[PDB]
């Protein structure tokens, strides 16, 4: 499906550009950007049963790999790949695995330290990678099912996220740096990165004339 938005396209898509007051450059609406990034953070973690089916199922894959059970992990990934051909993925294949590993030590440690679904599952993926490679390419089907999740998970191991998940990315890294879960959004790093990225791009005269204060 669609390419990830660049910082400028993202800013334009969410009406984040402002007259600043270097030539032919826009500023950012910080309050507005804060809210957009806060919106990207998604739901609080509050038991895996309340996760979307896709986050449920990939969490289970990663829990399996953390607990060194490649077979259970590959069986989910395998069934989801086939069933995806067919038309609708069978997320229920993940239920047995969740039941078995959701209360394991290494998983409880991740859940303890992260307040949002997206930041839990990012750290489950990071931890699963201490066992083996776990590429996005084992779960190609995710992009059309859930774009935000796909982008979050493809940013695990990266320095700089896609703007469309810059919120949950910044929050995730803030939680790791604080050493605790945070329910208060910690997304300021996403704002500063957007401002920097936007000031690098020149606007045309038409685009400058369309800027409001």
Binding site for its own copies (CB under 8 A): 1, 3-4, 78, 81-82, 84-88, 135-137, 140-141, 144, 154, 162
Q: At its nearest, how many Å lie between its own copies and the CB of residue 12?
A: 18
Cβ closer to its own copies: 96 or 144?
A: 144
Min CB(209)–its own copies separation in Å: 31
Complex with its own copies: residue 84 or 181, whichever CB lies closer:
84
CB of 77 to its own copies, least distance (A): 8
* 27-28 and 17-18 beta bridge pairing: antiparallel
Q: Output the smallest distance, CB 108 to its own copies, in A.
A: 31
Residue 203, phi-psi category: left (phi > 0), alpha (psi -120 to 50), beta (remainder): beta
Q: Is 42 left (phi over 0), alpha (psi -120 to 50) or beta?
A: left
Distance (Å, whole) CA 163 – CA 161? 6
In whole angstroms, how close is the CB of 137 to its own copies at the nearest point?
A: 4
Instruction: Give the SS3 label for residue 7.
Output: helix
CB closer to its own copies, 102 vs 136: 136
Interhelix angle for 53-66 vs 147-154, to 10°?
30
Nearer to its own copies among residue 88 and residue 206 (C-beta): 88
CA distances, 26 to each of 32, 80, 164, 207 (Å): 15, 44, 19, 9
Q: Closer to its own copies at the Cβ: 4 or 106? A: 4
């Amino acid at each position: 499906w669609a390419m990830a938005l660049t910082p400028m396209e993202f800013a334009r898509k969410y009406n984040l550009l402002r007259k600043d007051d270097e030539e032919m450059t826009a500023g950012i609406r910080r309050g507005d950007a804060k809210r957009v990034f806060t919106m990207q953070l998604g739901p609080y973690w509050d038991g895996f049963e309340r996760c979307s089916p896709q986050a449920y199922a990939l969490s289970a894959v990663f829990m399996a790999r953390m607990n060194r059970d490649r077979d259970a992990a590959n069986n989910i990934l395998k069934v989801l790949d086939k069933t995806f051909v067919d038309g609708k993925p069978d997320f229920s294949v993940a239920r047995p695995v969740m039941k078995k590993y959701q209360n394991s030590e290494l998983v409880q440690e991740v859940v303890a330290k992260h307040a949002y679904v997206l930041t839990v599952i990012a750290s489950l993926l990071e931890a699963a990678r201490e066992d083996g490679v776990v590429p996005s390419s084992e779960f190609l089907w995710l992009k059309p099912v859930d774009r935000r999740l796909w982008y979050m998970l493809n940013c695990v191991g990266r320095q700089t996220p896609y703007s469309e998940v810059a919120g949950p990315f910044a929050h995730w890294k803030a939680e790791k740096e604080m050493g605790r879960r945070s329910l208060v959004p910690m997304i300021d790093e996403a704002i500063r990165a957007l401002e920097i990225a936007v000031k690098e791009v020149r606007l045309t005269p038409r685009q400058m004339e369309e800027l409001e204060p």
